[PDB]
Amino acid sequence: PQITLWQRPLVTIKIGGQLKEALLDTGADDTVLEEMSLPGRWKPKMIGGIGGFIKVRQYDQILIEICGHKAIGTVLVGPTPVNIIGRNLLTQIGCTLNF
């Protein structure tokens, strides 16, 4: 589909059998979600925003459904202001910017 930007590009995602709201964010390199439990081991990672950097937990090969489209990739969990779907997953669902 085509999403306009007059309002926040919020979509429903499914992860760990739960539905959550997330922002389609072309400015983010990675996908970062609010604190939650994911399976497997995690690795440390530092990501930065306008205010500075934060430490998050990196989980790999996580199944996440975005607007019905299934994706499998790296998900970061940490103190993020909102659930963010970044370029690593946007590319998997074939998302592009057009104008």
Added chain:
Amino acid sequence: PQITLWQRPLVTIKIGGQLKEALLDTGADDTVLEEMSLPGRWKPKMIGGIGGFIKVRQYDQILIEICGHKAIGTVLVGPTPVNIIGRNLLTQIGCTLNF
């Protein structure tokens, strides 16, 4: 044009006659640029994201050229590490997210 997200969506913008590189950020409500001088009165504001908040100066009705498309809108100026073009301006150039 159609911009893929394999890499960060960086574009050239023209503001105050100056050329700059900026990130197209669908997750950002507003536009925030690195410290610079702009004519007119401004209002202080606080914007936050990953890492926390930063103080910025809000200028209204600023003319900006993005990829040859003229757009008018509010621009926030502050100690941001990267120039960010948010939704307030992306809408004016008719930018959409598609997949």
